[PDB]
Amino acid sequence: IFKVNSPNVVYTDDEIRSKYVYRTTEVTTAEDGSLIATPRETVYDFKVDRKLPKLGVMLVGWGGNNGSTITAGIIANRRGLVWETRNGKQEANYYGSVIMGSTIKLGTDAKTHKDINIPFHSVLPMVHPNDIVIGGWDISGLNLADAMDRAQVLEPSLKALVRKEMASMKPLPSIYYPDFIAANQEDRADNILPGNKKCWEHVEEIRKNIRDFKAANGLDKVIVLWTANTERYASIIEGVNDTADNLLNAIKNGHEEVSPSTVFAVSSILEGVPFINGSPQNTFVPGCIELAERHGAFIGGDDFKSGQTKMKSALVDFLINAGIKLTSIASYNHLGNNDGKNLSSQRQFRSKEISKSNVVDDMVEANTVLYKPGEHPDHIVVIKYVPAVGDSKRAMDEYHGEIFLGGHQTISIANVCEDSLLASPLIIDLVIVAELMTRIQWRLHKEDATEADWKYFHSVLSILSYMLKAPMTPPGTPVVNALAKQRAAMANIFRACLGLDPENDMTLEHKLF
Amino acid sequence: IFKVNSPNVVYTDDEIRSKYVYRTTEVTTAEDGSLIATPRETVYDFKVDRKLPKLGVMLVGWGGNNGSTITAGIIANRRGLVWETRNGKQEANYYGSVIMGSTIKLGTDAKTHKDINIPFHSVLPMVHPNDIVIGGWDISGLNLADAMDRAQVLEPSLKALVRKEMASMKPLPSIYYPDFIAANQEDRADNILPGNKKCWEHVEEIRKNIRDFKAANGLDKVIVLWTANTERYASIIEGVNDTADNLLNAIKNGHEEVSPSTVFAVSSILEGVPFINGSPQNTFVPGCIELAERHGAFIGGDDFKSGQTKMKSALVDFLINAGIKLTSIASYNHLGNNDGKNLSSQRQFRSKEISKSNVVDDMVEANTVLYKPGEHPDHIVVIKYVPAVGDSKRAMDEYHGEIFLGGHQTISIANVCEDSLLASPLIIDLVIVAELMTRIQWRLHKEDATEADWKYFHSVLSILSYMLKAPMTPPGTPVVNALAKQRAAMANIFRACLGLDPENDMTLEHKLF
Amino acid sequence: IFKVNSPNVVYTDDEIRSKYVYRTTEVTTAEDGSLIATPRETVYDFKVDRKLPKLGVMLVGWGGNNGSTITAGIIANRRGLVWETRNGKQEANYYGSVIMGSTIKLGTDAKTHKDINIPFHSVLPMVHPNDIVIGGWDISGLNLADAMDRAQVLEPSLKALVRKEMASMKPLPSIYYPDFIAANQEDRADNILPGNKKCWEHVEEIRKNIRDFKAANGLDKVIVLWTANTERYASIIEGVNDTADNLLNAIKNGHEEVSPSTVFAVSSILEGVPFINGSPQNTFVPGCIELAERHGAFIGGDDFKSGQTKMKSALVDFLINAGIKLTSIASYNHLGNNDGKNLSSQRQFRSKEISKSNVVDDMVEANTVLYKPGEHPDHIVVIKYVPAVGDSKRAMDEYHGEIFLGGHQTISIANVCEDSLLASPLIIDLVIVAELMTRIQWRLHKEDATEADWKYFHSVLSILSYMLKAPMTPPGTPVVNALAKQRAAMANIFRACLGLDPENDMTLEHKLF
Ligand SMILES: NC(=O)c1ccc[n+]([C@@H]2O[C@H](COP(=O)([O-])OP(=O)(O)OC[C@H]3O[C@@H](n4cnc5c(N)ncnc54)[C@H](O)[C@@H]3O)[C@@H](O)[C@H]2O)c1
Ligand SMILES: NC(=O)c1ccc[n+]([C@@H]2O[C@H](COP(=O)([O-])OP(=O)(O)OC[C@H]3O[C@@H](n4cnc5c(N)ncnc54)[C@H](O)[C@@H]3O)[C@@H](O)[C@H]2O)c1
Ligand SMILES: NC(=O)c1ccc[n+]([C@@H]2O[C@H](COP(=O)([O-])OP(=O)(O)OC[C@H]3O[C@@H](n4cnc5c(N)ncnc54)[C@H](O)[C@@H]3O)[C@@H](O)[C@H]2O)c1
């Protein structure tokens, strides 16, 4: 633990009221066409609620690969289970999680002159993942022990320990619209609500399920996470999905271009729970976003940045920030789970391909020294279904680049990654950060500020962009896709609630003496 | 171009006098063992000399692979030469250079709400690489056109254009101490000064050469860069190399444990020119550093971070900052130039292995959540001599990591990199940044400050750490090895001389509205 | 099953007496320097003993990685055990074995015109691996269940089934000469016979152990296989190891340059059991071979061709037989078992490096169109100890080649191979083929041949060369290292005992009609 010694930071047993000075640079164009840089300061008052709630996560796709892996891993970490591998004994951990497995720099030691590093989870009052309750919906009624055996992700020794408690968990019936997921997912749907079309009864039932989850479990806050199959893009039609009331009427009129995910998101917005989409499909259409802003409900980005895309975000940033001109990026993946079986259809593969292909455009528009306006590298993404490899995704990347005097650099990467074991800690990170963001309020520093001036963060949580492949940002704002930039954004926003200045890495006390 | 509109920044035609507030966090231990974080502010006055000098670089190892590549590339960029490749026409560029091929963010647009990115070279008044004069010493008297043909790095079409002017360049005689480089480099030395041992006449001759370079060329500033063969570690002996006067006496007494690089560095310190070591050997012993601090001469780090080590700095940082526990790093390189031939000896390979192996220790000591005190991954580095591959170094990396619930991640990387084409822009970056650092002065902001209170940066230039594999820091300070951290340090130090605040990446104007 | 309908093949319930015509080509130099090719025919009589013996294998290094894996796998296949993996249910098999997992072509169908393929194990009367008895010596007294847990090769579910029967197996004490294996293997030796030097009592004890194994178990034939640590090369000294009697005197005189493996081989030759060396060290010195020929004892080659070397034998053959000039071969391996720990010493790594480096010389001497006399590619082999990877050896190969008009081909291979699971079926293959070779006799076809003219194959079994990295051939004969050639040799020699002609692959009945 640590505390901040500053007149600007006031600690109360319920609140961490703090004063912060946001310092930025504003650029305006001069008369002769040159740029003028002006330092700007905005004084902000931040309020952080110290009380930790009893948090529940509702998973849409509970019986999937990722959902079963999560519920098993939370049980394993909560009980401190030790199991047997060929190498010997294995203990439960939260590796692969930036919040639960990484540290950030607090400051420099006065005496030793060395850096003080504290866990990322300990910066702000945050909910511990061991106490997270899981539930939700699935079109397949298989219990989560049998779902665990279907997934083929976990070792038999661990499954033996977690099977007794995971056999009592059965997902609630969900909604199946046949048009949106692949034709080979017909035989999977046995636990489905009455109706293959879009209706207002589905919204009522989903709201009832969220209510009953919170009531029966005894939870203070609920979060809904979409971990279901990738869907096809729902066409944007004027009068159907372009406005909150238009969409609310389209649900009742039973229009044939409303995704199941949109029904879940609408139910979440009407019940006041945050909704995070873990799939590349366009769950939030114009009208879902406006309904979220009209009600004050928090909504997150799309997809999960776990594996080849995370390393791509690191590498493209590193290579373009070093002066190497990337001309080709070729991503090849083949996998043999139900995720790859659903993406074997073109209409459902297109969404994932679009999500994977749009991670490098911001980095190539930032480097105007290498890339001319309109110059983009050849970015190809291929995903194939190989049933024999199972959950072990094999990714092959070829990065082709141009260097000094026309030289050629080629970087070939072979990644053997367990998909579910790389996305589960991301879900933990998403829920923990979203719960924290529901507990932070802000206002402008005035000499007569009242309690009525407290405001929340914008309904679209871009602070989750570290864990999201296709970040969703507030309407009209740019998108940040660099991994280091997103991690720094999260860390510095967390430090701003403590009145601490952002990390600059200059270290002038070691250079000027 | 751009200008800063701020009362703290005053622009004169010769100076950029600016006022900056260095904001950091200081950590002190409380009585009950907890940590206390206190915001600290140090007010600094920075003075930047706007006048650009005529800069000359003296290369020790001019006829090597890297030196010939540099002199050819500077000619190619200066003349704007276009040559023929199989793919068609190729123009000269400075790709692979962070200063000449990358951009940094200046600020946000007032109207568009989009980011303004300006070239890294345009942030501060900096010397253009097209105007850099080259010269120096080599033990081989071959002219640099024949040295270019010996190197086997450049295409015949480019060599045809640059051969006429590169055949008039002949390196000055150098000093050859047989004990320090490999036994297979005996036949290479034909241009050597009289003497196989350490003497004060060598210092006189090297100082004379630096003087004559500056006088004949008409230069305002000179920088010496060691681009010669990797040397063996010179033993630290009390009374020989532990003190500036002890070392100055050891040169005259002709002790047998003084490297040729130490003679070059001593000559540079006595003539007031900066010296940058581009090799893993310990050029600066205790006594060379003290002589540098006693005279005010600037000295740089060791080795060149070009290729597998740069990507290692990116990847290890990315993986450990994401919660993945690296257990094994295995670097394999084989190459067939004179660099690999000199490293075929164990005593000269040890220095490069030590330099390559110490890039990840700071990242594993920062993450106390994953690594216990004393826990280090298995880091192996292998370098082999394969004459058939030439300058094209083939690097194979295996990163083995532990992830959620005991999962295994393996990342296999095959890099085919032209060594000389990845290190030449690094040399340009080093000389440009070092020249700029010779033009920056600092002081503490007082109400009665005088002109006599202006001070330079510390003699050990750690701001070059981005381009250096084994960064040398001021005595008693920690070492930063993360690539993103070093680039951010350079950018934020450059912005501090303009009175601008460091980049925080928070973007609160897009989240709070 | 199948039978041969031919007057040349006579089937008896105990013998398969057959007549074969060995057809080859002989080359003699003409007067004008040209070559003359003459067809030669040698008529051979082959006798194959149909009776299958009760076979026992004695392993030197029983408690090692490979020995424990073998004894466990034989139990698993014998009992037909099914265990649990993450993917589901796994049954026992003999995959990775050329005899037990591959087929050979018997002939063409008269009616269908399609090929008839029969299992390699069914060509000749051969011992089934399910009935093989295991035993032997080890310097470590740990039982083989605890040795199995030490090895970290097998899944916990399989180990649970095999642990009860593998805990009753304890290796006999062995002989430890400290000079020959690495200094870090001191603490491993607790089950050692009295004596750190070479003595005749060791031969008596080893012979007693072989006798008692056969007597107690009730076996008809015994084979000894060296699966112990790699040793250093024993110097060839005149009067010590250059003659059978010289070596027999050197054992008694206690010379300090006689390997432990030589003592085992000598004991085997004096007891009449075959000895196969599975390590790169020179077990058979001049004098051991002569003793083998003087007694009639069978001795095999050196090392195990399992993994990167097998693929190297395939690839180098394929590339050089296709017209591609290999200029560089770079093999990198790192592993973390006791094998890699013993090879961390230079004197013990040299033997493995020599064994791995000499697999391509025969292929480059066969292609006189590409390689001039004395032209050899750059062949580098690196083996490193990385304790974190365990038995999973990571091999990285770079094959660099020259193609049409000076083009460059590069082939980069990343192999993740379980070392013990690739060498265990090789040991099964070696013992099965060696037992068969002890049951085959030959003679020249004469009109008055008697029973006294029956002869055995030469004491040095080169027919095992498929499974051996460093093939040992009869003194004065060339070595075959191509994998396809060795497999074809084995198949055609097996078919020659059946009176069948070698496979030619011409298929003229489908081309001439
Ligand atoms: N590395 C990763 O695992 C990763 C990374 C990025 C994105 N994603 C995305 O996350 C999602 C989950 O991946 P997975 O491998 O766990 O999936 P999966 O293939 O196991 O299927 C998800 C589950 O959702 C269920 N489902 C489908 N439609 C439903 C509906 N309308 N209501 C309720 N349940 C429904 C399916 O029956 C299935 O059990 C996918 O969309 C995938 O594309 C995964
Ligand atoms: N990617 C890279 O190229 C890279 C990266 C990191 C470090 N380095 C280091 O940079 C240096 C230059 O590499 P290179 O491939 O150009 O080297 P190289 O093999 O071509 O040899 C450098 C030159 O220095 C000369 N030399 C040696 N001792 C000398 C002395 N006392 N005085 C004058 N000249 C002397 C040699 O004759 C040779 O011509 C090496 O030490 C190398 O280890 C290179
Ligand atoms: N893929 C492979 O596994 C492979 C391939 C080629 C060659 N080999 C060779 O096969 C051998 C076995 O490999 P491993 O990984 O099973 O070995 P290992 O590292 O497990 O050690 C072999 C065993 O032999 C024992 N031993 C050593 N000296 C002995 C002696 N004098 N008498 C009795 N026991 C003795 C050791 O204590 C150890 O238990 C090694 O020499 C290895 O180099 C293995």
Residue numbers in the entry:
A (entry chain A), B (entry chain A), C (entry chain A): 40 to 552
Structure paper excerpt:
Myo-inositol-1-phosphate synthase (MIPS) controls inositol availability, a second messenger in signaling. In the first step of the reaction, glucose-6-phosphate (G6P) is converted to myo-inositol-1-phosphate (IMP) by myo-inositol-1-phosphate synthase (MIPS) and subsequently dephosphorylated. The fungal MIPS from the thermophile, as its mesophilic counterparts, forms a homotetramer, with dimensions of 120 Å by 100 Å, highlighting that the overall stoichiometry is conserved. Overall, the higher-order organization of fungal MIPS is in line with previously determined orthologous structures, featuring an extensive β-sheet network at a horizontal dimerization interface, a highly conserved NAD+ binding domain and an extensive vertical central domain connecting the monomers.
We utilized a minimal purification approach to capture the endogenous MIPS, preserving elements of cellular organization, and rendering the sample suitable for structural characterization. Extensive image analysis was performed, utilizing reference-based motion correction, resulting in a final reconstruction at 2.48 Å (FSC = 0.143). In the final reconstruction of the endogenous complex, we were able to resolve residues 40 to 552, which overall reveal a high conservation among all structurally determined MIPS orthologues. Residues 380 to 400, guarding the entry to the active site appeared to be in a folded state, showing clear α-helical morphology. The endogenous structure of the fungal MIPS displays a fully populated active site, allowing for the unambiguous placement of the cofactor NAD. In the asymmetric reconstruction of the complex, we observed persistent densities for NAD, illustrating that NAD occupies all four active sites simultaneously—i.e., MIPS is endogenously NAD saturated. To evaluate NAD dissociation, we analyzed PDB-deposited structures of eukaryotic and prokaryotic MIPS and could not establish any link between NAD binding and active site conformation changes, supporting our hypothesis that NAD is tightly bound within the active site and does not dissociate during reaction cycles in the active endogenous purification. This hypothesis is also substantiated by the observation that NAD does not dissociate during biochemical treatment of the cell extract and is present in our reconstructions with full occupancy. State 1 (S1) is characterized by a folded helical domain (23%), whereas this domain is absent in state 2 (S2) (69%), possibly due to unfolding, and backfolded in state 3 (8%).
